[PDB]
Amino acid sequence: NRIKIAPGIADIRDKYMELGFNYPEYNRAVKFAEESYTYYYETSPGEIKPKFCLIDGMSIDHCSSFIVPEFAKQYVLIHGEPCSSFKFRPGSLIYYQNEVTPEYIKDLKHATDYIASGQRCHFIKKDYLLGDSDSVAKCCSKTNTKHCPKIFNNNYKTEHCDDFMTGFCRNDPGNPNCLEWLRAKRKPAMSTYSDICSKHMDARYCSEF
């Protein structure tokens, strides 16, 4: 009983849960952390580590609620270090100092009724993620490269946009983007333009080809 929660010396997101029972040595405290910030930077180089302990058996969506949507568009969520959180305080990273440790938590018969295991939130920056053919068309055609991975937006230095541009450039062969795709001098581009110019050899883009 007499359960209390209070902020500590460190950041306000880190708190102490003071529990006082009838037994004198049960009148102790547990250091935990809960996240209340929205990240727009990186905690460590190349990653974001929110203090939200995603317990097993709940939506991973709740893990990403502490990141700006415009900043997490190029972040992927991966498995994190194991942690434990109060069942009635979801996403509460319970640190392990002194007697507190996951084996001790598992050993106690009553703690298994109030503590749920899981993993800590973890994000890695990779690149923008495409999800359908329309985004690939926008990225490769260079009509809207607002959110395009470097593999699909590098001015046709790689074979990623070859398949889409094969048809996009039959639609319009004089396009500066199609001509720049042909300047890469790969076999799909030259064969596509050989097919285009076998019918329209009297057009300017065939001179450039």
């Binding site: 359960i3 929660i5 939200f52 502490f66 359908d132």
Partner: peptide
């Protein structure tokens, strides 16, 4: 029991990906 509900989830781009529609992204994968 001092219960506090977690914040509502905000899905990102990675989680809102359907493998069925990604046939033009997976085919050119190196």
């Amino acid at each position: 029991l001092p219960k506090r509900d977690p914040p509502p989830g905000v899905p990102t781009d990675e989680m809102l990906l359907n493998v069925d529609k990604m046939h033009d992204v997976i085919a050119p994968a190196k």
